[PDB]
Design a protein around this ligand. Structure first.
Ligand SMILES: NC(=O)[C@@H]1C=CCN([C@@H]2O[C@H](COP(=O)(O)OP(=O)(O)OC[C@H]3O[C@@H](n4cnc5c(N)ncnc54)[C@H](O)[C@@H]3O)[C@@H](O)[C@H]2O)C1
Ligand SMILES: NC(=O)[C@@H]1C=CCN([C@@H]2O[C@H](COP(=O)(O)OP(=O)(O)OC[C@H]3O[C@@H](n4cnc5c(N)ncnc54)[C@H](O)[C@@H]3O)[C@@H](O)[C@H]2O)C1
Lengths: 317, 308, 317, 308
């Protein structure tokens, strides 16, 4: 039988992700949402598009978790977003309400598709993937969060733009927690293996512009929201998560910064945070421990501790 | 120079089309919209997504018509969804004007409704060759027809040929007589038990109403995934000179009994636009449905010319 | 684990098929041949190409059947070709020698990958697929021959060329035995569902040109050989067979003329011959019984009987 | 008009390249060869294969140079594998002449060996801009280097960056110092136990010799799958203006200490050909290997100019 991909949450990101799954014939799709008839509407739109693409993909809409039975992969966008930010929204609403949805999603995964590879997108990302892992009981290797691939896609793009080379040939990474305490890694940026500093010396780019690109990367999500007025980014967020899903389903063994369960690496135990990892047919297969400078480890430590604060505040109740 | 694709209108359809242009590396994408900043917001999102796809596509958003200069393809969703007819026409008039000033060699694909009517306003206002302007509707209506037939037979939509002609709307005309499975007449599958004559009739009316069917289930807005894909397939056919056979709203000069009118019929789309009109051997009944389908189009086109 | 595709025979067709499998990331490939080191050379060439395509595909060369263990799909080009044609080659060499290789291939499939979907290309095609089925003991649904997709690709192309429309939008089919007694179906040719006769009346094509295209289709293989001097077609033959393999592995349910096991359909029992079929995740899933004219059934009967003659001559010894 | 890709030489590499052009719908393909009928035979085979891929690509074979008129890209494999140097040069002279007559705006990618030497003969004989002529070698040598490194680490080749510069041959110069895993220096993976310093050295010499390694195993002929893919990736970079960073044999005017010579170095390939040369910060040892690598090229280029 085909691979089964279930999208928990059928908003903008969920629909586009399902569009990519249909365009790439990655497998049968299931769009789930609490809103009645809505996932069923997109599914029929998307079903019609398969006709234009000359594919066979089955896309289904549903308001019941039962239809995620046997899913090979599960990708979760459901919950409140950051669009309101009201400075008390993250603390009084985002964190406490989303944690409760993650617990309900995790329980449904546990009963209906406990073998799936599970990719979380809901924010606060690092916190929510932990909660989803706890509630679902699945191996820590098969539950991770999408954040670094998106933050890296922005980083790489901004670099590629100034240098005027294809983004394929810009290697860039962003680690740490997803959010304002993310850590772009300017030292590790290369152009097809060439350190970026070589282009600084040859005048393709300058050091300040690089520092600007670091900050623009950290705020890229808000830059787009502000410009949209209504809504948030969904084209790149959806591709990033489907890159990770394609890496799992085709055992591509790609190297991508993802939010994953550490156990000693980087001096972190029993915690989810963004790090470079190898994604393969068996999920998160290897964590790469980068030889970070002391300064870099400091930014990583301050970012890893904000994640703790919130994991603990959530554990209060 | 890369091909340049300008999307006049950056709503749901326009943005979805821009994404397909970026995934398929069809060319540089310009997202135009009257709304301030919003196109630029989507453009940056889309730009980011090129890193994930490892492409080099340039996607820019703008609020100034000047940025469509030199466009090889223009795709128009600008409009709204009882003042809608004349307001959409002033828009379509304005869009068509900027096209002639800025990119008078573009292949233009109108999407806004009433499609077949607004197509002719656009051509008149832009003064472009009649074969370089057309409307996307038949590809989408056929993809629904094709899809519904495919799922009942349990074969791939690729091997279902099905077409829809006439005007885009509730009176569109699916053609069950021409449906085939890899060229095998659909009727052969009635006789061998794959589908019944009643289910075909039911499917034919579900195709007529699919637009509203989707609208009722979404609750806010209308379909756009298949709409976007249909427009891009038409643009891909022009950019790569694929000579595809597709139902599109095109300028007829006597074919089917229509003069100086844009109406949905099968055409060959290639590097020089709408390169050939296919004139089907329609039966009297089928020709009758076609005539009643376009009646509304011929009236509206006359009424709008009066209001100039 | 990835899907495993084994190519029995690593000649021109076998290598190209493996190139397509690598380009399309359809799965892990195994190139097998009796020639020592040769399949291993192509595999390393192809391995290098995956670097240019930015894929992860594992391509392996081998001279041992043991390495086809667990194959999801098996595609067989091995044996003598038609390139010599010496009028006694088909009878004294092609048929008797290839049948013996098919029996050895079938036995190796039976012991090492009895769950595979098996696509035969060796000629005489309809005869050899039967022999391979007998020797391997696998379900008749999971063993078929590639012939009609190639003969149809030629038919469709010749039509598309004269009309000057994309071949995608020309539906054309060829049924019967692969070879000189193949049956192009001019009546069933459509342009996106439109009968071809409509274009005859409107002057895009004429009836004689159509009849020429029927004959050119029947001789297309020899036309190319003659022009090549050395060798035979391998680009289209390889794609055709990989289309059938992609249809199985992705459960695409495509409609394609293939050589398959009939049991009453078309008044043929216990025999392999080319007919329109639906290929899906479970192999050959449905045979389509076309409402052929009496004339058409006559050409089909004369083509189905030449296949018998050879199946019986082979059964002598 | 579709892009026009002419392949001067229809052997194994040339035909494999034509197939990739047809699969990727990059443009119309012209297969030229001196051998009578053989190109036409492959063209018809390839044409048939377009039906299976559902593309509209035109593939023609010919024995007359006139059919390359207007080519946007030309890719040259014409040659043979102790008279081979001067015979290949008369050929490369002849090919370059017909190019200037027939398609003097083409992007030209030479493949025949000794690559870096025959590249300069071609440019001289064709009189084309030095940025519109280059040679494919570094992409292939890097794809082997990249591949060997990828399989030992068990990561995707996509996330291995590795380069090879200098001349194409046994003296080519892999650059283990610049190898990275998604930008992470390869040395970090020594320290954490993924690969050893000895296996890198071994890999670096296996890259040098991969060409012959393949040749020994095939028994007849040489590699062509990766060779073809590398040339097409370079042509795709030109046709779609992808601005790819790739090691190619390109005209240097003082970079690296080379004047009026074609040598393998990293470049940016885009819509205007070889748009930029990247000048790496090579160490003394690395610069030394580079100089010894091109010594043979500078001598042969001088010796062949004398024989005119
Ligand atoms: N022909 C078909 O089959 C398609 C099927 C589905 C719907 N398609 C029709 O085009 C649009 C549907 O596109 P979309 O779903 O994206 O509607 P949106 O509301 O999201 O976007 C409309 C945009 O159009 C922009 N726009 C852009 N320019 C203008 C001007 N110049 N005036 C007014 N509005 C303008 C405006 O800011 C809006 O953002 C509407 O007119 C439909 O009748 C037609
Ligand atoms: N630079 C690289 O890294 C490539 C790596 C692999 C091999 N590449 C070199 O080009 C070719 C390899 O291509 P191929 O594998 O296809 O060699 P073939 O023998 O199959 O084809 C050579 C064709 O070249 C044709 N040809 C075409 N034109 C001519 C002329 N004008 N003179 C002589 N020969 C000509 C001739 O008919 C032959 O069919 C040879 O010169 C190699 O040194 C180079």
């Amino acid at each position: 039988k085909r691979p089964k991909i279930s999208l928990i949450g059928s908003g903008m990101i969920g629909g586009t992700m399902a569009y990519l799954c249909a365009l790439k014939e990655l497998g049968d799709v299931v769009l789930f949402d609490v809103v009645k008839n809505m996932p069923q509407g997109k599914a029929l739109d998307l079903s019609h598009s398969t006709s234009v693409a000359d594919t066979n993909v089955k896309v289904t809409g549903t308001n019941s978790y039962e239809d995620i039975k046997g899913s090979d992969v599960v990708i979760i966008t459901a919950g409140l977003t950051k669009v309101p930010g009201d400075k008390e929204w993250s603390r009084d609403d985002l964190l406490p309400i989303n944690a409760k949805i993650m617990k309900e999603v995790g329980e449904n995964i546990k009963k209906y598709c406990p073998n799936a590879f599970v990719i979380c997108i809901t924010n606060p990302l690092d916190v929510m993937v932990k909660v989803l892992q706890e509630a679902s009981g699945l191996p820590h290797n098969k539950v991770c969060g999408m954040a670094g691939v998106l933050d890296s896609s922005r980083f790489r793009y901004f670099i590629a733009e100034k240098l005027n080379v294809s983004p394929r040939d810009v290697q860039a990474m962003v680690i740490g927690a997803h959010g304002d305490n993310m850590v772009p890694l300017p030292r590790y940026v290369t152009v097809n293996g060439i350190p970026l500093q070589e282009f600084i010396k040859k005048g393709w780019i300058t050091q300040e512009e690089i520092d600007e690109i670091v900050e623009r990367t950290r705020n890229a999500g808000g830059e787009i929201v502000n410009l949209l007025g209504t809504g948030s980014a969904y084209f790149a967020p959806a591709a990033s998560a489907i890159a990770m899903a394609e890496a799992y389903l085709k055992d591509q063994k790609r190297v991508l910064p993802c939010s994953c369960y550490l156990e000693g690496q980087y001096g972190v135990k029993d915690l989810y945070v963004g790090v470079p990892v190898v994604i393969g047919g068996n999920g998160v297969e290897k964590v790469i421990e980068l030889e970070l400078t002391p300064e870099e480890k400091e930014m990583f430590d301050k970012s890893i501790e904000e994640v703790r604060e919130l994991v603990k505040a959530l554990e209060a109740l």
